[PDB]
Paper text:
One family of these GEFs is comprised of the Ras guanine-nucleotide releasing proteins (RasGRPs) that can activate Ras or Rap, of which there are four in humans. GEFs activate Ras-family members by triggering the release of GDP and its replacement by GTP. The N-terminal portion of the RasGRPs contains the catalytic module that is common to other GEFs that operate on Ras-family members. This module consists of a Ras-exchanger motif (REM) domain followed by a Cdc25 domain. As first revealed by structural analysis of the Ras-specific GEF Son-of-Sevenless (SOS), the Cdc25 domain interacts with Ras and is responsible for nucleotide release, and the REM domain provides structural support for the Cdc25 domain.
Numbering used by the authors:
A (entry chain B): 1 to 26, 33 to 117, 122 to 166
B (entry chain A): 61 to 74, 79 to 108, 112 to 169, 195 to 430
Write the structure that this text describes.
C-alpha cells in the first residue's frame, strides 16, 4: 500500500492528543496505537500519525519529526488567541526545515470563542492551505481534517 | 465513590491504593475538597478508633507530599481547621497537632565529554518533581515549573552547542573532524545508556542547519556515517519511536537518563481515557497506569551513576553550554559556509 507520515503540530492544551486519539480507537505506549489502516478515495492507505505532546520543547526532536514528516496539522483552539498567533512561527520553522514555500499542511481550529473563523481562513488563504474546524469531544469533525491532509500530500 | 475511595485503612500505622490516592488525586479531584471530606467524615459507634485512623492518615499524607500546601491556601486553611478542631476536642490524646503544626575549549576526549554531559544531565534530571509533571500534563506548558524547564533548556543548549561547535570551524574537513568526534561521543553515550543526551547530540548532528553540509559528510568516515545512520534510526519518529523503545526495554542497570517522550506518553494516557465516568465516580485504572509510569521515573531518580567526574570541570562545561545563539544566527552561519 501507501504509507503517509502525519504530524500533529500546535501548542499544548488544545486537545491535539485528544483529537488524534479520537481518530483511531473505538495503549499509546506501543507502536500500533499511532498507526491506522484506512481506505481513502478508493485505495487503502496507512496513516502513521505522530503527536507532539512533550516533543515540542526539544529542538532536535522538533527537527526530526519535521524532516521525517510529510504532512502537518497546524492546530489551535478557537477560544485562545495566542494559540492562533503561534501558527505563524510554526509555519516558518517548517518552511526552513523543508526549504519550500509549498509544504503539505492543513490549518485546524479546535474546541464562546475568541478567534473568528474569518481570521483563520484569511491566514490559511494567505499561505494557500485548507482550513477546517473540529470538536474533539462530540462532533469529531476529525476524519475530514486528517483525510484533507492526506489528499494534500497525495496531490503534492 | 469518593467516600468509597477514601476508605483506606491504617492499623495505627500500616498499602498500594493509599499511595495511589494520595499521589494522584490532585489530577482529577482537587485536594481541598478531599481535606474537607476527611474533616466532615471525622465526626462519626465506638469509633474514636477510626478518628485516630483519620488523624494518622492526615499526618501520613502531609508528611509524604510536603508540597501539597505551597500553591494551595485552601488546603492549608482546611487542614488548619482540622488540627484546630482535633485540638479543640481535647480527647483521643492525639499529639498529632503538637507534632504536626511544627581560543580553544574542548581538549577533552570522547568518553570524558560523554561522562561529564551524563553527570550534568542526571543532576538536572534528578531535580525534577512529579508535581512538575502534573503541571506539564494539565497546563500544557512546562512554564512556571523550573526543574523541567532547566532540563529542556539543558537539552536545547546541548543541541545548540553541538551545532555552533561544528559551524565554528572553517572548511569541510575541520567540520568533518568535529563530526567524527561527536559521533564517537554519541557512541559512548549509547554505551553508557544515556539516551536523552544522546538525542540532544544526535539531533545536533541531524539538525537541518548541519545536515545540509554535504562536503563535510563527504569527508566524514564511512564507518562514522554508518553509526550516525544507525543512531538516527534509533531515535527516529517511526512507530512512536519503536526502535528506541525496543532498546529501552533491552537495556539494564543504569540505563536511566530518559527522554521527554515519557511526557508525551503521560499526556496520551491523560486524554485517552476519561478522568471521571458518567456515573459520577472516576475510574482508577487510568490513575494506576499514570502512577506506575511516574514511579518509574522516581525510581530512576533514585539510582547512582557508575562514572564519576570533576565538579569544577562540570562548571566549565556548563559555562561552555550557556551561549546565546538562535536558529536565525545558526542558519545564517550555515548559509555563510555553504
Amino acid at each position: 500500500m501507501t504509507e503517509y507520515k502525519l504530524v500533529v503540530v500546535g501548542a499544548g492544551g488544545v486537545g491535539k492528543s485528544a483529537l488524534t486519539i479520537q481518530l483511531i480507537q473505538n495503549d499509546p505506549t506501543i507502536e500500533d496505537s499511532y498507526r491506522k489502516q484506512v481506505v481513502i478515495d478508493g485505495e487503502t492507505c496507512l496513516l502513521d500519525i505522530l503527536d507532539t505532546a512533550g516533543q515540542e520543547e526539544y529542538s532536535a526532536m522538533r527537527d526530526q519529526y519535521m524532516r521525517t514528516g510529510e504532512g502537518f496539522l497546524c492546530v489551535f483552539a478557537i477560544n485562545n488567541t495566542k494559540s492562533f498567533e503561534d501558527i505563524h512561527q510554526y509555519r516558518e520553522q517548517i518552511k526552513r526545515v523543508k526549504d519550500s514555500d509549498d509544504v503539505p499542511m492543513v490549518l485546524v481550529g479546535n474546541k464562546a470563542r475568541t478567534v473568528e473563523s474569518r481570521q483563520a481562513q484569511d491566514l490559511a488563504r494567505s499561505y494557500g492551505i485548507p482550513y477546517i474546524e473540529t470538536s474533539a469531544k462530540t462532533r469529531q469533525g476529525v476524519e475530514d481534517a486528517f483525510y484533507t491532509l492526506v489528499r494534500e500530500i497525495r496531490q503534492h | 465513590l469518593l467516600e468509597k475511595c477514601i476508605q483506606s485503612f491504617d492499623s495505627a500505622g500500616s498499602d498500594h491504593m493509599l499511595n495511589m490516592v494520595l499521589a494522584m488525586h490532585s489530577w482529577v479531584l482537587p485536594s481541598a475538597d478531599l481535606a474537607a471530606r476527611l474533616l466532615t467524615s471525622y465526626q462519626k459507634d465506638t469509633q474514636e478508633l477510626r478518628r485516630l485512623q483519620i488523624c494518622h492518615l492526615v499526618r501520613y499524607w502531609l508528611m509524604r507530599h510536603p508540597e501539597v500546601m505551597h500553591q494551595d491556601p485552601q488546603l492549608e486553611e482546611v487542614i488548619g481547621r482540622f488540627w484546630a478542631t482535633v485540638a479543640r476536642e481535647g480527647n483521643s490524646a492525639q499529639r498529632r497537632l503538637g507534632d504536626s503544626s511544627d581560543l580553544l575549549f574542548d581538549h577533552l576526549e570522547t568518553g570524558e565529554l560523554a561522562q561529564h554531559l551524563t553527570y550534568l544531565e542526571f543532576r538536572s534530571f534528578q531535580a525534577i518533581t512529579p508535581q512538575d509533571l502534573r503541571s506539564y500534563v494539565l497546563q500544557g506548558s512546562v512554564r512556571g515549573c523550573p526543574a523541567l524547564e532547566g532540563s529542556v533548556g539543558l537539552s536545547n543548549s546541548v543541541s545548540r552547542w553541538v551545532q555552533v561547535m561544528v559551524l565554528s570551524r572553517p572548511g569541510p574537513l575541520q567540520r568533518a573532524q568535529v563530526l567524527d568526534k561527536f559521533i564517537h561521543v554519541a557512541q559512548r553515550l549509547h554505551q553508557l545508556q544515556n539516551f536523552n543526551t544522546l538525542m540532544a547530540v544526535t539531533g545536533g548532528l541531524c539538525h537541518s542547519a548541519i545536515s545540509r553540509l554535504k562536503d563535510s559528510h563527504a569527508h566524514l568516515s564511512p564507518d562514522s556515517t554508518k553509526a550516525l545512520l544507525e543512531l538516527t534510526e534509533l531515535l527516529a519518529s517511526h512507530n512512536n519511536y519503536a526502535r528506541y523503545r525496543r532498546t529501552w526495554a533491552g537495556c539494564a542497570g543504569f540505563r536511566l537518563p530518559v527522554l521527554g517522550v515519557h511526557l508525551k506518553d503521560l499526556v496520551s494516557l491523560h486524554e485517552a481515557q476519561p478522568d471521571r465516568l458518567p456515573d459520577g465516580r472516576l475510574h482508577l485504572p487510568k490513575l494506576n497506569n499514570l502512577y506506575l509510569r511516574l514511579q518509574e521515573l522516581v525510581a530512576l531518580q533514585g539510582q547512582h551513576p557508575p562514572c564519576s567526574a570533576n565538579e569544577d570541570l562540570l562548571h566549565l562545561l556548563t559555562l561552555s553550554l550557556d551561549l546565546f545563539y538562535t536558529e536565525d544566527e545558526i542558519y545564517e552561519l550555515s548559509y555563510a559556509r555553504e
